[PDB]
Design a protein around this nucleic acid. Structure first.
Ligand SMILES: [Mg+2]
Ligand SMILES: [Mg+2]
Ligand SMILES: [Mg+2]
Ligand SMILES: [Mg+2]
Ligand SMILES: [Mg+2]
Ligand SMILES: [Mg+2]
Ligand SMILES: [Mg+2]
Ligand SMILES: [Mg+2]
Ligand SMILES: [Mg+2]
Ligand SMILES: [Mg+2]
Ligand SMILES: [Mg+2]
Ligand SMILES: [Mg+2]
Ligand SMILES: [Mg+2]
Ligand SMILES: [Mg+2]
Ligand SMILES: [Mg+2]
Ligand SMILES: [Mg+2]
Ligand SMILES: [Mg+2]
Ligand SMILES: [Mg+2]
Ligand SMILES: [Mg+2]
Ligand SMILES: [Mg+2]
Ligand SMILES: [Mg+2]
Ligand SMILES: [Mg+2]
Ligand SMILES: [Mg+2]
Ligand SMILES: [Mg+2]
Ligand SMILES: [Mg+2]
Ligand SMILES: [Zn+2]
Lengths: 38, 134, 125, 94, 136, 176
RNA sequence: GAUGUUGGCUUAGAAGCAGCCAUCAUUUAAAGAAAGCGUAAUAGCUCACUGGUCGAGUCGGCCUGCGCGGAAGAUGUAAC
RNA sequence: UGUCGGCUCAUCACAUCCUGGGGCUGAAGUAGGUCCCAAGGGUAUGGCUGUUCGCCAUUUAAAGUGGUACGCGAGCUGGG
């Protein structure tokens, strides 16, 4: 979970979401792309 | 249902043929020497494509087709290897009669409507490896 | 994609070979390889047959160009049409043996004389 | 062909101009020829999307002012420094 | 790393940075990187940036640098009281006002240029935008 | 929106009781009940259900869309029912069903047993495979997931409790 | 999601997918000498692209208004 | 407005040294790396140096980082 203040789409399968007032980046493909803002 | 490109009267080295279609259940020496018995007529040094058709009983039927556009363009321009830098560096030459001979061989081997369509697909493989058409 | 101008020109080409053609056959094109389809395109240019897969609501506009208008309900489902510009038949005799050879798709409804022929009676052509 | 609608300016100076620019309108001028100058105001948007073509600068356009057209060319134009905006346009009578 | 070959005087008044920029327009290239915000550019910044957009174009097209760091900044070192003169010359800077054009570019595809300029601006202290040269 | 405006057809023998915001749908596969969000208004017409917003709310259409999916699944539930399939990957992983309790031998020390909540029934056609039937989509899905919770299927040999359909990707050992 | 074809170069192997260079032509409704996983190299898996079903709006920039994250400290809330 | 260090006594923070929960890994397991959450409790004896610090020896689950007039002389010491 890369936790950082700039979060992005690292491929075409990464999908941005706002859960509980946090912006995360979720991937089906690549567990390494899982991000949270912070 | 496999395909390979095998030199004219040749077969049964280990890295090119035996393992590739040998993991598929095919008897190796019947393919090898019925293919050297069929392709004994292909000139020495030309790879000729062979389409191997395998069935659930391992008895196979292969259609040996005519030598590649690239191999008949290696031989009709006289050359050995084509260009490593195609249409930048140009390695040989063929008049339209050789485009049309290679495209009668491949008139047996193409999808083309006319010998102009097969001459144009051999034109395409003539621009691919660098060769000049003259 | 296709601009309105694109679609207009293409409707003009289908309407133009439709006027010039003696007989037509509409069929399902689904579930068949491009290998067997280029095989029926060779068996097509050999029989004089003009082969096409064209949009449906495009073919209502081209077939409004007469007298194939009995075919406008044959355009529901994927449409592959065989126009024989040379000879009538040779589309309808080629398609039944191609669909029995493949055992895929359908070959639904034909048109000749200005009338539509149901699927089991295309043996007339 | 480009047709720009405009009104005659009843005011002048820095104040007038900046109230103009706040209202999403902007000042320009029409001079050249035998006549006197004519100061006018325009809609920022219309013109901003109009000069978004090249010909605007090479061509004879028309300006509708109080029922009356004038035919003019684009002479020079000063733009706001960093903003996608127009401060002003010099129109020369065509 | 840019710096005046020779100067009239060695040191300078801190001065102010006020008002707007001159050279608001792209006079050479097809595209340019314009500054929206107001700030001082050290030579280091400009150099690093020029590098960034030089990697980005794979050394094709052409790049101008419209700004020059001509004014010297001083610093007294640590642990030194006030007075005893003016500090020693540390580095050079260019005063930047809103609407200057930092770099110009051309001979390249637009998309690529917007990109290269994003990468260039990552290295800059101030707010910047992309711009195209116009007719008139 | 594009969801709320596709109405739900209630098939024959499927009973719709609407009291205020409280729906109760009954049928051959059992009974279910749901209080809708207050922003939504749902109406019964012919045999079909139609959902639209109500005034005084901003979100009316998102709430609606959800209402539609909910009651649609509630219909499917008491007619056809619902099925979830899991299977256990790896040696010595067993599954037994005694009444509403599932016996899992997952390779822990102790036996792992899962109480099933009401409205859910389970069966193992094998040692390595469980299937649950139930009316309630959300509930059966949950239960399924709790079973998946015990041993989650893993990065290498795939060992664990997976859904029968579920795609599992592994990776190789770090070489050396 | 096609033929020439495993384009040529190179390699023990490069076959759209190490690397270098070209990137044409055919049957086309459409099919990159291929956008990724894959192989010792293949095979195998999607994509670009097009026909079908569907049925009315959808795409992404620009300019701005107000908000979100970025945001940790010591006695006690303690930054209306 | 008594200056370093030791002593006695502490107390707060959290940017966590251990123990607790967790994501990602170039995570086979064992053992780790990095990040997230967490202040409930725990957090070494000696040799040398006036020492804080450090170095070394041998421990332990670990020998946390800081605030408190670099906590604490109307509590002690006086080596500096
Ligand atoms: Mg939560
Ligand atoms: Mg005055
Ligand atoms: Mg004033
Ligand atoms: Mg001054
Ligand atoms: Mg000046
Ligand atoms: Mg629109
Ligand atoms: Mg904030
Ligand atoms: Mg924090
Ligand atoms: Mg506190
Ligand atoms: Mg108050
Ligand atoms: Mg923390
Ligand atoms: Mg842990
Ligand atoms: Mg290991
Ligand atoms: Mg960890
Ligand atoms: Mg503690
Ligand atoms: Mg407690
Ligand atoms: Mg001691
Ligand atoms: Mg010690
Ligand atoms: Mg001693
Ligand atoms: Mg001592
Ligand atoms: Mg003290
Ligand atoms: Mg202390
Ligand atoms: Mg003291
Ligand atoms: Mg005291
Ligand atoms: Mg003393
Ligand atoms: Zn991703």
């Amino acid at each position: 979970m890369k936790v950082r203040a700039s979060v992005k789409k690292l491929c075409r399968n990464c999908k941005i979401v706002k859960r509980d007032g946090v912006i995360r980046v979720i991937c089906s493909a690549e567990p390494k792309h899982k991000q949270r803002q912070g | 249902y496999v395909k390979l490109q095998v030199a004219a009267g040749m077969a049964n080295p280990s890295p090119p043929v035996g393992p590739a279609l040998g993991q598929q259940g095919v008897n190796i020496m019947e393919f090898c020497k019925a293919f050297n018995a069929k392709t004994d007529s292909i000139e020495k040094g030309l790879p000729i494509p062979v389409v191997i058709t395998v069935y659930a009983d391992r008895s196979f039927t292969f259609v040996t087709k005519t030598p590649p556009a690239a191999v008949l363009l290696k031989k009709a321009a006289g050359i050995k290897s084509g260009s490593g830098k195609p249409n930048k560096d140009k390695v040989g030459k063929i008049s339209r009669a050789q485009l049309q001979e290679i495209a009668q061989t491949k008139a047996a081997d193409m999808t083309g409507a006319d010998i102009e369509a097969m001459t144009r697909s051999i034109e395409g493989t003539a621009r691919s490896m660098g060769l000049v058409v003259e | 994609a296709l601009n309105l101008q694109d679609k207009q020109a293409i409707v003009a080409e289908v309407s133009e070979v439709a006027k010039g053609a003696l007989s037509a056959v509409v069929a399902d094109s689904r579930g068949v390889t491009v290998d067997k389809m280029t095989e029926l395109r060779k068996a097509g240019r050999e029989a004089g047959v003009y082969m096409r897969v064209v949009r449906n609501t495009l073919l209502r506009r081209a077939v409004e160009g007469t007298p194939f208008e009995c075919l406008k309900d044959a355009f529901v489902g994927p449409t592959l049409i065989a126009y024989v510009t040379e000879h009538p038949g040779a589309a309808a005799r080629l398609f039944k043996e191609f669909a029995k050879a493949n055992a895929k798709f359908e070959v639904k409804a034909a048109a000749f004389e200005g009338e539509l022929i149901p699927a089991s009676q295309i043996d007339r052509l | 062909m480009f047709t720009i609608n405009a009104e005659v300016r009843k005011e002048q100076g820095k104040g007038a101009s900046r109230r103009l620019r706040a209202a999403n309108k902007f000042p320009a001028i029409i001079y050249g020829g035998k006549e006197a100058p004519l100061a006018i105001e325009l809609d920022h948007d219309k013109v901003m999307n109009m000069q978004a073509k090249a010909e605007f600068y090479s061509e004879v356009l028309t300006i509708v002012v109080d029922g009356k057209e004038i035919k003019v060319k684009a002479q020079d134009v000063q733009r706001h420094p960093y903003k996608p905006k127009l401060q002003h346009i010099d129109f020369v009578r065509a | 790393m840019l710096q005046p070959k020779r100067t009239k005087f060695r040191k300078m008044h801190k001065g102010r940075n006020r008002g707007l920029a001159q050279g608001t327009d792209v006079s050479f290239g097809s595209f340019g990187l314009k500054a929206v915000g107001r700030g001082r550019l050290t030579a280091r910044q400009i150099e690093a940036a020029r590098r960034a957009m030089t990697r980005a174009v794979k050394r094709q097209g052409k790049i101008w640098i419209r700004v020059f760091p001509d004014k010297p900044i001083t610093e007294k070192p640590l642990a030194v009281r006030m007075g005893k003169g003016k500090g020693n010359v540390e580095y050079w800077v260019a005063l930047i006002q809103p609407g200057k054009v930092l770099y110009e570019m051309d001979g390249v595809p637009e998309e690529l240029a917007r990109e290269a300029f994003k990468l260039a601006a990552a290295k800059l202290p101030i707010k910047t935008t992309f711009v195209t040269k116009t007719v008139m | 929106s594009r969801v709320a405006k596709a109405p739900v057809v209630v098939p024959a023998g499927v009973d719709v009781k609407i009291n205020g915001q409280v729906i109760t749908i009954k049928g051959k596969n059992g009974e279910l009940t749901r209080t809708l969000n207050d922003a939504v208004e749902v109406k019964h017409a012919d045999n079909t259900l139609t959902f639209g917003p109500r005034d005084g709310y901003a979100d009316g259409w998102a709430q609606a869309g959800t209402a539609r999916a909910l009651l649609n699944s509630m219909v499917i539930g008491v007619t056809e029912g619902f099925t979830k399939k899991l299977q256990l990957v790896g040696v010595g992983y067993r599954a037994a069903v005694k009444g509403n309790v599932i016996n899992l031998s997952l390779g822990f020390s102790h036996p792992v047993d899962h109480q099933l909540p009401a409205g859910i029934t389970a069966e193992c056609p094998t040692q390595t495979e469980i299937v649950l039937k139930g009316a309630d989509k959300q509930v059966i899905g949950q239960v399924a997931a709790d079973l998946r919770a015990y041993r989650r299927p893993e990065p290498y040999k795939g060992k664990g409790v997976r859904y029968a359909d579920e795609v599992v990707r592994t990776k190789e050992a770090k070489k050396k």
